[PDB]
């Protein structure tokens, strides 16, 4: 409406206040409220209606008159300076990290205050989700799941620890399992956590820490499960990225009585480390403790990497302290270093072309002493390993050896490193689960923590599997939100109603459908006698010529993406928008070739620790299918349990206390799927206010007679007086529900003509006396029917 404030797109704050002083077909001439004369232009989809009272905050976001992402951004801007870091959006908890310890919130008196209290009546906190998940376990007769997203530094580690604290305090009577995850956190900071372009410490796996509950409601055990891993990162990294952190912390923290036994050298030597960044994280004090022979030329030129918490020299010490606490001796700790060092001496093995004698490939002469120092770490013979890295062993039933091509041997040598390190991380997790064996199993409350929608300027194959994992989790997110709203309307007595659902199945079919999907073409290209990346890119727009979820790079508005040639990349639209991916090295990173001749050699090792790691047809196997198959084992497990979605917000780039950046927070609202769920709720009734809320707001505008009434009869009389439309306004059981922009329309009816409103209250005065009679008459008949129940029941005792 005219004259009414709208939100305006301001680059430094996301949205600010502003008014509309001219308009065109597609654009609005926006004049800011605080900066008059600045008068810019904005499009129809870039403006949002603002509320009249903007100085107030709400605990529950369904109490807003205008529910959008600009009024959600202003609600968490006001709450940030009131130190209210938790915010209730239906079944979604929005938690904002303050980087400081707030008083009394983690208190045990606070924990027993929340215990058993109804929902929504207590202030938002993370203990109000954990108490709800215990009650929607035992009552429901179904297991539960807490889903934690967000980027690194957003508080997703700290929110996980408060969940496990509440279960071993409020309901668990004893069981000290809570901090055994926390105490062996540096093991997963080495093995699983790596370095990405926008994050220094990022988890690259689906952490599923589950807590077993028995039928008697006691904590009987826990279990840690892991899903996904970046197979490519193990052997080849991007620009300025690192590999996993155990390949830097072992290099930085190793002593010289360990270096003589593992034959370690500086990272420049090793091909699985020199591709990316070789620098260590350190501080001034630990920079003095790093030995000269551990330093690479890049380390000499550019020095240590700066982080306030990461220290690759000092956290190797706090890793080996944690291996003493968890359950590992020094001999078993050394065997977890012999496997890591064997991977480093595998990547330097090169393959030339054979001298016409039987076809195939042979090893290079510069790779001879490098094989001798690697085969004793793997427990195998150097003459048998040379055959196994060059031949395809089969039978004619004699057993023949048929040599492989040069490119197939480079892919098979890196496939051994993507198999040994894959089973090594599964051995670390299984060893940790044997340090706290569960007593029994029945019901479970687990925490799924994984990285959010993460993307860079030029996206890789590693980020393609992350954004594909978040799209499938976005499908299940909106599926659980629609089910909660349909059983809210029934619970308030409004019954069933039609709501429009948004589908993303067409984006899923684009990526993973049989024969036509992007991962299906990628796995087929490996089978060709000559694989290409130009043939892969052209095949995507061969089979998918139409569709809106996919375009050419030149169609993008961004200049950087317009420099990409047609056969060098593609743009795939996801829930968080249009994300471009380049296709160079995509097939190479997907191609894995672990075959019989090498799979049945590392299992046959003379070393015993190596055989413990590994517990015709198919040759090259299906590599692009393992990414779909492993994810389906988690999605159907999430469908079988309840869900508790906790979205974690990072408020500023520096990660320092009391700083709000609305050009970085708004980007995480649109990359969390929060804005998508607010679009869904416009289809229903997004604005709802309890009877006590509408009594505190509107009693001053009413006559003194109507003001004397109780909140439910005050609202019932007010709804009947005005004569409101039944499809727009709905009278619930504890709340009044509204269609979009009709709580706002309601607020203007109360601010309109006092004499007209007084006359409508006069006209409903007979009905109001009759309603107030029947209220006390049927309440006295209620006490008499409960007196007749006490007698009827005690007649059968």
């Amino acid at each position: 409406e005219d004259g009414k404030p709208v939100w305006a797109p301001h680059p430094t704050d996301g949205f600010q206040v502003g008014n509309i002083v001219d308009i065109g077909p597609d654009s609005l001439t926006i004049e800011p409220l605080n900066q008059k004369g600045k008068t810019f232009l904005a499009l129809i989809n870039q403006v949002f209606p603002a509320e009249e009272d903007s100085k107030k905050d709400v605990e529950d976001n369904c109490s807003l008159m205008y529910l959008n992402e600009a009024t959600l951004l202003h609600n968490i801007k006001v709450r940030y300076s009131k130190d209210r870091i938790y915010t209730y959006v239906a079944n979604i908890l929005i938690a904002v990290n303050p980087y400081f310890d707030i008083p009394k919130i983690y208190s045990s008196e606070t924990i027993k205050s929340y215990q058993g209290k109804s929902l929504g009546t207590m202030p938002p906190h993370v203990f109000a989700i954990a108490d709800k998940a215990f009650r929607d376990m035992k009552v429901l007769k179904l297991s539960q799941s807490i889903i934690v997203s967000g980027e690194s530094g957003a508080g997703k580690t700290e929110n996980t620890k408060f969940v496990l604290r509440y279960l071993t305090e409020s309901y668990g009577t004893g069981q000290d399992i809570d901090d055994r995850i926390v105490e062996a956190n540096p093991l997963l900071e080495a093995f699983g956590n790596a370095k990405t372009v926008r994050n220094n410490n990022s988890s690259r796996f689906g952490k599923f820490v589950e807590i077993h509950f028995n039928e008697k409601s006691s904590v009987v055990g826990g279990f840690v499960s892991h899903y996904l891993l970046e197979k490519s990162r193990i052997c080849v990294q991007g620009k300025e990225e690192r590999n996993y952190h155990i390949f830097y912390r072992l290099c930085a923290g190793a002593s010289e009585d360990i270096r003589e036994r593992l034959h370690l050298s500086s990272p420049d030597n090793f091909r699985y480390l020199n591709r990316g960044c070789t620098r260590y994280f350190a501080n001034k004090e630990t920079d003095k403790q790093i030995l000269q022979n551990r330093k690479s030329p890049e380390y000499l030129k550019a020095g240590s990497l700066k982080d306030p918490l990461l220290d690759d020299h000092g956290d190797f010490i706090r890793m080996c302290t944690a291996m003493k606490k968890i359950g590992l001796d020094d001999e078993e700790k050394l065997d977890l270093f012999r496997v890591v060092a064997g991977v480093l001496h595998l990547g330097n093995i090169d393959f030339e072309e054979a001298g016409s004698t039987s076809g195939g490939c042979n090893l290079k002469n510069k790779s001879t002493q490098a094989l001798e120092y690697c085969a004793e770490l793997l427990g195998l013979d150097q003459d048998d390993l040379r055959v196994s890295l060059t031949t395809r062993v089969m039978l004619t039933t004699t057993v023949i050896k048929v040599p492989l091509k040069v490119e197939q041997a480079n892919n098979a040598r890196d496939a051994l490193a993507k198999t040994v390190y894959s089973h090594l991380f599964d051995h670390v997790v299984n060893r940790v689960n044997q340090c706290f064996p569960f007593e029994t199993s029945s019901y479970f409350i687990g925490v799924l923590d994984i990285a959010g929608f993460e993307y860079f300027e030029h996206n890789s194959f590693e980020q393609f599997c992350i954004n594909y994992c978040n799209e499938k989790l976005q499908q299940f997110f909106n599926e659980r939100i629609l089910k909660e709203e349909q059983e809210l309307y029934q619970k308030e007595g409004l019954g069933v109603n039609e709501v429009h659902y948004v589908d993303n199945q067409d984006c899923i079919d684009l990526i993973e459908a049989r024969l036509v999907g992007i991962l299906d073409i990628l796995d087929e290209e490996n089978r060709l006698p000559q694989p290409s990346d130009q043939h892969f890119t052209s095949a995507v727009h061969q089979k998918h010529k139409d569709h809106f979820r996919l375009s050419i790079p030149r169609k993008s508005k961004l200049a950087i993406h317009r420099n990409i040639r047609d056969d060098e990349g593609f743009i795939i639209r996801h829930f968080a928008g249009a994300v471009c991916y380049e296709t160079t090295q995509f097939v190479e990173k997907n191609n894995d070739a672990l075959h019989m001749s090498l799979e049945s050699l590392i299992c046959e090792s003379r070393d015993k620790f190596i055989r413990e790691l590994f517990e015709g047809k198919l040759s090259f196997i299906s590599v692009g299918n393992k990414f779909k198959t492993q994810l389906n084992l988690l999605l159907d497990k999430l469908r079988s349990t309840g869900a508790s979605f906790i979205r974690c917000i990072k408020p500023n780039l520096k990660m320092t206390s009391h700083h709000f950046e609305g050009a970085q927070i708004l980007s995480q609202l649109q990359c969390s799927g929060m804005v998508s769920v607010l679009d869904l709720m416009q289809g229903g009734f997004p604005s709802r206010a309890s009877f006590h809320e509408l009594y505190n707001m509107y009693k001053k505008y009413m006559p003194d007679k109507l003001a004397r009434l109780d909140p439910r009869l005050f609202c019932k009389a007010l709804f009947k007086a005005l004569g409101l439309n039944e499809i727009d306004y709905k009278f619930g059981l504890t709340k009044v529900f509204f269609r979009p922009g009709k709580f706002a329309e309601f607020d203007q009816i109360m601010k309109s003509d006092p004499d007209h409103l007084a006359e409508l209250v006069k006209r409903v005065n007979h009905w109001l006396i009759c309603s107030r009679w029947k209220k006390v008459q049927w309440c006295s008949l209620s006490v008499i029917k409960l007196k007749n129940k006490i007698k009827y029941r005690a007649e059968a005792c």
């Binding site: 035992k138 009877f691 009434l709 109780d710 029947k774 049927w778 409960l786």
Partner: protein
């Protein structure tokens, strides 16, 4: 079971049970309404019928549970005797009529806020025969409608 028009009138009466407006009542809430309208139950007995209806395990009575807490298959004349026993809670002097003073005493005990002029206004609408007092015939035509 109860009819749809009988559930609607008990739904407005449930706001006198639930004055806080959270949609749910405890034994601190359901006890204080019984005692304010002259009936004193013992805590053990009202716990036993809560443990019948509450399936949530929380001990908190929401509206569908409140409906099955007062429902029971009763005989035909049993029903009419409950309506007559309600009339006798309004009638304080036991003459078979409800005056303005007697109606004001039930209002104030249930917490309804109203003036002396409003009490005279209420009695006047309920009265049909013109004596200014509500006999059982006039009480049932107000209840029913």
């Amino acid at each position: 079971q109860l009819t749809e028009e009988q559930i609607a009138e008990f739904k407005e009466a449930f706001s006198l049970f639930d004055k806080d407006g959270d949609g749910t009542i405890t034994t601190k809430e359901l006890g204080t309404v019984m005692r304010s309208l002259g009936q004193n139950p013992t805590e053990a007995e009202l716990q036993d019928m809560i443990n019948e209806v509450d399936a949530d395990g929380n001990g908190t009575i929401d509206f569908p549970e409140f409906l099955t807490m007062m429902a029971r298959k009763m005989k035909d004349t049993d029903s009419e005797e409950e309506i007559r026993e309600a009339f006798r809670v309004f009638d304080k002097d036991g003459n078979g009529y409800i005056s303005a003073a007697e109606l004001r005493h039930v209002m104030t005990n249930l917490g309804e806020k109203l003036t002396d002029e409003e009490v005279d206004e209420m009695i006047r609408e309920a009265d049909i025969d013109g004596d200014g007092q509500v006999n059982y015939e006039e009480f049932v035509q107000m209840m029913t409608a």
